[PDB]
Subunit: 461 residues, 4 copies
């Protein structure tokens, strides 16, 4: 094709159609103004055509997937094999050969679509865990290409990764890239060690820096660069949006509809067993039982956005959470006044922002998370410097947001102590922490992240 | 002793102490004004003395039970063997010989306490399923006594009753009475048939009437009378209480705290798998899913009062209900506005009455219930003639309250159609039904019930 | 059509084809020698033709059923609604409207096939619980027909039957017959009472006899006869077969292959939660634990023939039984010598007979069973007068086989005492019981049963 | 005290008393001949005295533990917190503060007993995961002591270890030793990294060798040596024992009692979810289903020795295994001939050896195991060079026994292919592998292991 910069991701950046706002596609916008850019991905509808769609600023190359392809490659291998394994086997991975075979077939299809789109010597950026085979496949089809890969989820320790029957094929797949990136040095280091242990490659031995001090894996003639690039958000855009009059009015109205509580705790997560939602509810229930939280003036709002309903583990998790909600309200609420409000539905963006602005305490307690953007979005929204962020150590965000109230979600006693501390912090201490968090998040945004990855990738030429 | 009228029940009519209001003890009040009355029962505290406590109007004979006695006789045999069996094995009965043996021992202890209290030729009224052995034991100790027994729960069909390894001992136990009473002719008829089948006794063959047309079982020289006496409430007292200014004000305030819904559905139950609470929640959820109930102006309040937490079946039921609550609100509620309010705690009497007065639809949907007094209490409270009663056929109350919206709780389609009908009834049709229900309940109260049983018992002399 | 005697049953009497041996079709053989006989049923293959197949002695009228029809009418309504309900809700019935609707449609299809086959004034005999609507449907299409119906499973008490949302349609369905038969007087009496209670029909009030003293239900102009006819086997044929040299040799070989135990206990059941297989295993395990059975010279063989694998309750039951087997052998067996041998597969007829002949104790312990033919087959096989039958009271067979060791399967203590008694009986006592059981079974065979039902049906003309 | 060499372990080396044969205490025997040796541990009985017991060759210092101490320190913290966590969270660890507190208290008690026994400047060797706090505690009480610690179970990756709320206290605890040893370089390397990440200590960065190329952690003034020392058995003793006439006769008799199969597969494990017993049964069942194993001449014997019955996870595992056994025999066995023989009981040593000698295929398929001595015992027993070892990669043994048939137990397809390969290997190929395995195991025995650890520990002086 005629594209000199190509993004490859599981989905096209569109909504059933119009171009989806925010996210990655928006971060790459000023680069697409200087490159002939293409995006390869599944359009979210089964058995579509693979004819290029030109969005003026971007050419879209759709990948044809059947509903069966999605079930086995995505719902199956990606979400029920790789996802639990890479997140410290919080649930038991399912190892299924038919899923693996479809994962391979689908990955090859993405590689072929990429080759179609990519001009000679083009730069290719492959995204995330569903497409780990693409770099090697693409290099085999197109050795002229410069290929980066970024993993948006954690890379597990070798002891767990080795369970995968197709461990070598996945590792070889990633090693097809010129640059392999992770959010954290820890992931990068796991990858280097895996390369020595499983593949027998020569690697660098030093610690991996942040956006610097890169690792290397020697693969025959070529070197694979390995780095840590912690993703972020468009901090300035969110900061601006959260100041809008209508947002502030909605935040006030939200507190009124809750019966004007003195304190609001907020959870916002795509529903997932990685997110530690059960831990928040348990801590909140025990604090109420112990009379350490006032059931008359404190309320917890949990917004869970629907996710992967076709995967049994997620249905079971939804059942457990919903029981806890029912239980806590039955024990500590009053008719007309729950202590927990729980919604299981997508939330409009401006509604989400209003909740961030209304919340006195943001509860972000994942058991394991690659980064977690919600923690950073909350911070970017609190230009009033109010609020408090309670944040699990087991998120990538915790490496940057050390001024938050950090918790080990497995240490329930300390999660409880910490929620009480956040609820009762002095105004001045709250401001001190929020000012420091905002300096970090405003300076380290999605633009810095993308530039850093692309600079590293360009240097491999 | 010196008491010529003696009530025997699992518990003394007191609260940890003061005499408990309402109920049986209040219905017998004008009889105790003419008799030397006694009450035998456990005082609700472990390992107490058995020394008589004179309440001027009544002498209380406490029965000493250890916490272990309560666990095996009551929590065990009564609540985990007899209770599920007599209620159509909604949950699997547990047959345990140690429980049976303690049930026997405890029953003998009640029989001994009774004999102590009862004067020569005295009238004795034994209450309910925990004390089914007492009549035979008492007749053996004291053949001079006139003994009635009333079962407050259903008497199961013979096919189920026969499962009980101690079926003959229980049947013989009841046959020790001069009069055996049930709420319904159906129970009485089951008992007659059981007497022929299991014991080989000669019995009457005709249908058993209501408070009349009694059955008989011939036991050697003596005849056991068998009858149906449907319990009720103090209708006039509740009717009066519900008109109080403070109650009406609270009912208005309740609707305001719910965000002034157009329609309130109400469930009030001691928590129990017999009560069909899960069925109401399922019906309500499906109606919301189908858009047949308006999620913006209709709300369901379920008040579940704690019961038998030491019994695993009840903990599991509580878990299922609480999941449904969480689920329904997550799907159809809004932050600040649940469609289901659920409380798991005792409710003050005047608060309960305010809820009856506030509720547009009373949901009483047991899978199986001896009578269900809540259905009658709601009716007695609605002197404004507003409201609507949705009532399971599988309650004793359904035999008297035919003007209610009757449902087969297993017929979920019809339960749903019926809830929509009740919510949308014309004012005039609602009044017609409520007027008819009140005529029944006001005329057939707990005083008529008690008089009828005691007249029948006196006639056995 | 031109058939003056027509049998209607869920399946044709054939095997995927050849005419299936034994059973009903063999009992009717000398009647088909005098009548133009027809058989209506599903041929066991999906979407077949409905063209008559003449077997010289019989005309076969196949009913076309799709795999979906079978799933909803049979696997669904028959096996997951009616079956658990009629067997004292050992598992929870599922009430599903789509299943009911297919059950109706399929029943009408059987009725139409019947009408096609049946000559004017013909006698029709409809079999069993899958076809309860057929008599009324058939009478509506063909008021000239004489119609009998026999239920091969128990008829539940009214308290349970009333759960069925389509209770009235089923009752009306059965009332379409001239004669409704059950194995036991108890079923007949339940039906009479149901007729009064649900339908408001006038019925007889006396006890129902065995093959005599029939009940009646008055339905407008016509009377429905109600009777008890306990099914049996071809006792003489089995008695003869069990004496064959090859059978006796196999029985000896079976004992040798088991390591020549002193005592063999045997269970033979179509796998079903009604059969009380779990109870036998529990009793056997506790006896071994208590050292009351000798683990060195006593062995239990359980033959479970596969049944209804598409129904979840049966898969769960299979899992529980298989755990008990594994557990008991792990605890009390030796390598090379299990104390329990368990097979889950169909057994050839002559192999089954050899096991009957080898077994010292036959364990037939259903929680609830219409008759249970295995109990009678064992007896018919023991012309040597050896062996012992342990038999649940909750089978129809227990009403005729009172000389067996009868047990309440819920009374585990007594089941255990009884198994020890059977294992250790004197030769003379064993013979006394087996002689008496054989007199009953040899005199009361399937020929007496069929004649009695057909005589009763003929008398309705 | 007066002991210059002291072993500290959870239990004394005795049996309820007499000195237990084999194991560690036997390996140290020629060292105790030159040192004043002591052993500190719990005597296995609750609330005993702590008075020294002199065994002439050894002084025993008993530690007083109550049954409650054992429940919280051992059954609780050791077996339900540490054990699952260190074994790649195959089951979910339970984090309980009361368990942690008892673990601390008990560890301090072991430290005090040690100090009592240990002479000035004595050498102390602390054993295993129940006693990880002892080295730091002991160094604080007795800075004169030389302290080694060896972990017999895996040391998990940092991502999992970090879950532990008391992660720092455990790490500091181990860092109290002069020498910290693991079976594998991988564990040692995890420990070094943990030291940098959690404690901020300076460590060596190179790979850790086997019994050489040691790692180091700098802790203030002192250096902690870190090493890999793979445990083994008394290879020569077992080799000798397995040649005994009575053992060989028993092995022949075992095959006869199994009905002289052509092939015997054997599993021998302390029952534990780490052991992958479920995987063997699944593979065996699928091979039978596929007809790839002959159900007529191949038999699988699984010997599971009882373990940790008070821990719920182990009861659930026992239930799953026992179901699989029952299921497989019901499907593929015959009466008198199971395809799986399963025993849940301790086996005498000489019986175990006879089974090793009888087995054509040894199935050692743990999901995760520190070493696994059963794999090495089998090899040492096969001086006839017959047999075949199927061995999980996820055992420490797999690093030394590469000539075995290695499998990824999560790769069920390959486990199945491998079992077929082992069952059908040529005699010559079997001998080649067994000869090579025996050279390794005979040369690398428990004496080499103990000498190597003690030499490393002595060098820290
Ligand atoms: N408009 C709107 N309505 C909702 O209802 C709504 N609900 C949520 N959101 C927004 O979605 C995003 C969720 O961000 P995550 O951090 O949870 O990312 P993941 O989905 O888990 O996916 C991976 O990739 C990320 C980036 O690399 C990593 O952080 C993760 O660790 C990694 O798992 C946030 O921005 C949030 O605000 C909504 N947005
Ligand atoms: N004050 C107050 N606070 C509460 O929270 C509160 N919560 C409930 N209640 C009152 O308790 C009574 C419950 O009546 P039930 O009908 O449910 O009776 P059971 O407890 O099930 O016991 C048996 O005996 C009865 C009589 O024979 C039969 O009807 C039953 O079928 C039979 O099972 C009602 O009156 C109700 O209003 C409260 N009252
Ligand atoms: N050849 C062969 N191989 C096997 O593997 C094999 N396995 C079993 N059998 C034979 O099947 C028959 C099972 O008889 P049931 O009594 O259990 O009858 P159900 O199947 O439950 O069906 C209903 O109808 C019966 C008659 O009215 C009632 O007794 C029942 O109560 C009622 O539920 C016996 O004859 C037995 O020997 C095999 N026969
Ligand atoms: N006599 C007798 N009767 C039995 O019934 C009987 N049943 C088993 N055994 C013997 O017990 C020993 C079990 O050895 P393991 O390797 O399984 O060790 P663990 O118990 O899991 O404990 C840890 O420490 C070991 C050494 O560091 C590591 O290998 C382990 O990875 C690690 O978990 C073997 O020797 C075996 O033969 C019996 N012995």
């Amino acid at each position: 094709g005629d594209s000199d910069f190509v993004v490859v991701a599981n989905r096209l950046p569109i909504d059933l159609w119009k171009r989806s706002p925010g996210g990655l596609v928006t971060a790459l916008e000023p680069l697409l103004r200087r490159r002939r850019g293409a995006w390869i991905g599944w359009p979210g509808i089964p058995d579509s055509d693979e004819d290029p769609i030109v969005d003026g600023d971007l050419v879209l190359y759709p990948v044809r997937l059947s509903a069966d392809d999605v079930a086995q490659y995505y719902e199956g291998f990606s979400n029920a094999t790789l996802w639990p394994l890479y997140h410290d086997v919080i649930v038991k991975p399912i190892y299924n050969r038919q899923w693996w075979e479809r994962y391979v077939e689908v990955n090859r299809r993405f590689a072929e679509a990429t080759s179609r789109a990519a001009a000679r010597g083009a730069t290719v950026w492959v995204q995330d865990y569903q497409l780990q085979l693409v770099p090697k496949m693409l290099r085999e089809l197109r050795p002229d290409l410069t290929i980066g890969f970024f993993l948006h989820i954690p890379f597990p320790p070798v002891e767990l990764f080795m369970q995968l029957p197709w461990r070598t094929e996945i590792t070889d797949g990633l090693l097809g890239a010129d640059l392999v990136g992770f959010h954290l040095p820890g992931g990068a280091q796991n990858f280097l060690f895996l390369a020595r242990r499983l593949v027998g490659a020569n690697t660098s031995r030093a610690s991996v820096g942040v956006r610097s001090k890169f690792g290397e894996v020697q693969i025959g003639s070529r070197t694979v660069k390995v780095g840590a690039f912690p993703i972020s958000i468009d901090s300035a855009d969110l900061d601006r949006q959260a100041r809008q009059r209508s947002i502030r009015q909605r935040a006030r109205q939200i507190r009124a509809e809750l019966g004007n509580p003195r304190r609001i705790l907020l959870g916002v997560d795509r529903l997932d067993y990685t997110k530690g939602i059960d831990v928040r509810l348990q801590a909140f229930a025990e604090l109420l039982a112990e009379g350490r939280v006032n059931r008359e003036d404190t309320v917890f709002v949990q917004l869970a956005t629907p996710s992967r309903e076709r995967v049994e583990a997620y249905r079971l998790l939804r059942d457990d959470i919903e029981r806890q909600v029912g239980h806590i309200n039955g024990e500590y609420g009053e008719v007309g006044h729950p202590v927990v409000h729980y919604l299981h539905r997508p939330v409009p963006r401006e509604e989400l922002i209003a909740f961030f602005v209304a919340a006195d305490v943001m509860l972000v307690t994942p058991l394991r998370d690659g980064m977690n953007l919600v923690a950073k979005e909350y911070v970017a929204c609190r230009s009033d410097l109010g609020g408090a962020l309670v944040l699990s150590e087991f998120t990538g965000a915790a490496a940057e947001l050390g001024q938050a109230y950090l918790v080990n979600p497995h240490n329930l006693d300390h999660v409880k102590d910490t929620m009480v501390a956040a609820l009762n912090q002095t105004p001045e201490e709250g401001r001190r922490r929020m000012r420091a968090l905002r300096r970090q998040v405003l300076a380290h945004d999605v633009d810095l992240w993308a530039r850093s990855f692309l600079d590293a990738l360009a240097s491999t030429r």
